[PDB]
Amino acid sequence: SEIDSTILSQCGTLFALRMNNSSDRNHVLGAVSDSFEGLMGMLPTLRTGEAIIIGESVRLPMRTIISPPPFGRRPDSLDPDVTAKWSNNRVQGDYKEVL
Amino acid sequence: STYIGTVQDVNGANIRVVLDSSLKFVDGQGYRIGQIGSFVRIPIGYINLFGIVSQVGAGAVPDKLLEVEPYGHRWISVQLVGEEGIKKEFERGVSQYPTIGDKVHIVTEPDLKKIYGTQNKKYISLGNIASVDSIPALVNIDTLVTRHSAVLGSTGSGKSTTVTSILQRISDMSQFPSARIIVFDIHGEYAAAFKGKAKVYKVTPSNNELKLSIPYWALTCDEFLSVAFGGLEGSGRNALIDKIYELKLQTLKRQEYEGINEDSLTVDTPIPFSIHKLWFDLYRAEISLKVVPNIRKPLEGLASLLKDPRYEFLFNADDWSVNLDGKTNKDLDALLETWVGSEESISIFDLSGMPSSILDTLIGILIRILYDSLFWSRNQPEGGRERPLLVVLEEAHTYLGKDSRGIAIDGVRKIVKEGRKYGIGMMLVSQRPSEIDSTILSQCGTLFALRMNNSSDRNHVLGAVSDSFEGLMGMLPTLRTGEAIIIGESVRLPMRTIISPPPFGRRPDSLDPDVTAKWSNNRVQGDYKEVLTLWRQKKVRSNILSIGYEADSMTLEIEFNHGLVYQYYDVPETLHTELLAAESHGKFFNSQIKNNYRFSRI
Amino acid sequence: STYIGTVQDVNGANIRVVLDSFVRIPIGYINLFGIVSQVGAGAVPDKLLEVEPYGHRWISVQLVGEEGIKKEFERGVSQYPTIGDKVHIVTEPDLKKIYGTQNKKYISLGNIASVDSIPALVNIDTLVTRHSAVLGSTGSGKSTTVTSILQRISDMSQFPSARIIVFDIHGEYAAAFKGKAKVYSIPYWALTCDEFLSVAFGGLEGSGRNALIDKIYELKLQTLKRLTVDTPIPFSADDWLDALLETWVGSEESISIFDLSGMPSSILDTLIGILIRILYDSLFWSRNQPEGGRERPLLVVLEEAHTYLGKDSRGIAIDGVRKIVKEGRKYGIGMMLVSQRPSEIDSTILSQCGTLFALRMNNSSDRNHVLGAVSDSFEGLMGMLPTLRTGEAIIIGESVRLPMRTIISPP
Amino acid sequence: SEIDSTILSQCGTLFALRMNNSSDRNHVLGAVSDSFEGLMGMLPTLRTGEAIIIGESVRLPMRTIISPPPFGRRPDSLDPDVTAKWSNNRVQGDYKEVL
Amino acid sequence: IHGEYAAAFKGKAKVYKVTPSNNELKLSIPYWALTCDEFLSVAFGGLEGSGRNALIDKIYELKLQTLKRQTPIPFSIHKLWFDLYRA
């Protein structure tokens, strides 16, 4: 719902995944060429991985489960895990180093 | 009676049901068979299709049937939410949608546990669920901290107590011995919740309490000029910047600091420099301890600031006061250690006793001292990567305005945008969501919605929620006191919990002067000459748990709850020993002692 | 028996009822309540009009609060109603309970519009500490209402040691307070230097300002023998200090007034600012004494404020009023805003007034602004403003459990 | 059909005359409690001057022919008579007065 | 609203036209009988901004002036026009 409508309408293909709130669902329906009654009503409960691909890149709209990449080849961000860090017993620190 | 009826319509994401019979208010606890937000389930073959009650009554019957049966309404609309695995787990999304004529049951305790319970170690307990018995509300802790939070509601909703509960449950020494949290208390009420388990910094410390001091040389150039002078923009600004540079270079030549030399010295550098010498030298050219002597008006302004007890937390720091020679007893090491490295996890910078005019520019400064200090040591064992931090902000709608031009907005926006990498959280306690900038409220991860009376703010909340679920958001303006709707990515699904209130005696209360008490007691003549002798110099100098003893000054001393110290003057000591031996506390003192003798609180 | 109809639609916070202003819904052991939000042919479901647009027997009601087992009445509900439930009409005991409170912090200010027996209780502690606000119109006769409030919360029956001040201009309250309250000399040296320059000399700018500050400084010093410039020590007209303080705050009478009709309109803003600053500064330093605001809170009330709290007024009064609004809570200092034309008072100040009394309002701009500057709101509190009876008022704020319609009367 | 029903409801006595369109008969018959098929089905063939009175001003509703007032007392607007004013021979006129 | 009953009662009633004849009455509705909102609607169009407040206040001075010399009380437009247009 935040992407500029004119730009979003010039994308040939779409991979509509699970969509939760009632506003983005409508804004997506409002820029999809092959608005297809059968499949667009099941947007809000596609599982983790499903993707309704709609556009000219496919002859007829699909409902495909994207094949997951093999383990180890997954996207991950090395952000800290507070529960595993706040649990470690405190160690005396010298703040001369921080300053 | 795990049975309701048969699905009659199936729109893929909006099924409907036709209730069959009579509604009974189950006694003992009060849970009815079916509510507006109550969950439902549908066994399909071998798996379970769970849903939420979206609408009840004439609003769910299929449309044209109203023409068929104008006044026949027995239908419900259920929106199907997720699904259960084959004895594996609950996951969202549906592998296969239902057909017409299926069976629709009601949620039972094992399903309560399966949906709501989990096995990950991150999740913790923050109050049990409403409309069902004994189900702790599990909130992911990692996501809640690193993905930022928020609290919203009405004035009497009770958000301070919810925040107190969360902080109490998030810092217990049992599981999190090295926690760390900071609270920018403003009205000054949390300080009563954590009596002997947190550090509190005020402006007028008590006998067993600390003094908040923010040295004036820990500021950048822009911040310091903003606080002191209001942001000069002429050649006077250039003159003052050059003078600050000269003072810092001079002190560095006087004293040595690790790895700083004239080649890498800037105004932003946090090193000591004497304000008094600056003022005196910049004023002599236009004509120390004591302030007796084209930027003149600025220098009268700063001179007035120097000798002002209100500004005793900047220019007359307790031991961060800097001598003439740029020499201080202690460096910023002690300040950082106390603020974030102390032995107590939580610290409270209650800013109630601050000149409101600067309050905003004060908040920002602290947020800049912490972040900038936890960013340049992100590899050491004292940075945010090794012991992350959570910041709390009370009454955020005044500083995070959509159009506000202060500095706090910049700091909070920076923590929201860039705090993920370095483990910095944020918790915005607010009261009028529509005020808060819509770009920042859309980056907060989790939301603790509460009662909201205004229709103009409910719409804002509904329009700015990641999972705009309606079964749990059509009931915003009727929630109880403490009934919270948790929606975000910090929980597997929306929750409708009640927060376990903190035990009696551990609660926040800003000690406001109760007008009833101070106007019911009988009038006693005042010594206004004391008021004048106290104002000229610009200075301030039920239950009973102890009584002071003295028989030489003709005085009495008493202590109440909350650390209130009262000194009663001109009291003959015979009555002192009479009271002490009376063993009548709260009654004899009530009898003829409340309003007989003068007393001055200390 | 009393009865209205049956519930036929629910979406959590909004109910529809089909027939055979407050309303009560029973559940057994507990009692839900509510108010009729929308009525008429527009209340029916959206597409149910097409089927039958002329038979209207649907009423839309909003749940409001819950009542326990004769314990208390608290907002928000723990359960909800479902199809097949009953709806009654509010009776005398129901009003007796929802508006009846056992807390000692509540004081009676009047009665209900329909019923006269039950008082219109208000929490004085919040009314003083949080803040107050009275918005009215020329023909609403706000004077009698505010007088009744002032002399009803300050009676010597239960609050002998009250302390109030009125900054009245038109002098109308002098007649209202014959002898039951005081009525009214500001020294020319107490006020700060800059205010004195502004009031008398006309706001000098050049080096003459510096020379005059200098001269006043040495006159101030030489006064001491027979340290700072701003010291309120007398130096060498009656109008153009312990006794003055006691007369202002230490007087035996509970209330006090300041009639400023005769003074010029030009300097009156600076004078109100000076007075308010003096009071606040004195009661901020006297915090730790029996004379302080912590032991006898003070309340300030001023009328005709819409000419002083404008959106971009440059007077000194706005600064002191803002200081009271923000920091005055801690030191036990209150405030009360009376204004017959609130469209001019800035929103950023009117948004901080906890308790709001509304009187007869006719114009649309005022009716829009009041809704835009309120923390609570009900649908049954917008369309009846212009038809209010003289002497009635609508209370909305956090100092009352629920918003009310009440008539104020002297005791 | 278009008048407000809220203000029409409270009216006590009603006079109804011949009606042609089928959208107004429904509104008028929905404005009366005495739902009689005869009293609102014989409506669209009522001669000029006939009318049915329904309400508490009349003991029993029924159809009656209202007598006409005598010649010389009969409402009529004096709108121009085009056929008579166009039949007469063209008269040369001067528009200077009109301007 | 069609001037159709005037001929019904040749002499049994009295009519109030807007452009009468030598021997007929003239309808007269003094503006000042109107209430504030009605007058603003008829003469101006129901303004809301500062102009509405200015005119509402302006009426008050003239009304109270007339009353003190001797709410539905007479007052003059022309003086209003000149006074607040000369401004």
Ligand SMILES: Nc1ncnc2c1ncn2[C@@H]1O[C@H](COP(=O)(O)OP(=O)(O)OP(O)(O)=S)[C@@H](O)[C@H]1O
């Ligand atoms: N979960 C709760 N259950 C019952 N009472 C609560 C609960 N939480 C808070 N309260 C009480 O409701 C009153 C107000 O709640 P507080 O949280 O203390 O104040 P607050 O108004 O929410 O904070 P501000 O002024 O909006 S920042 C107090 O009497 C609380 O004791």
Ligand SMILES: [Mg+2]
């Ligand atoms: Mg609070």
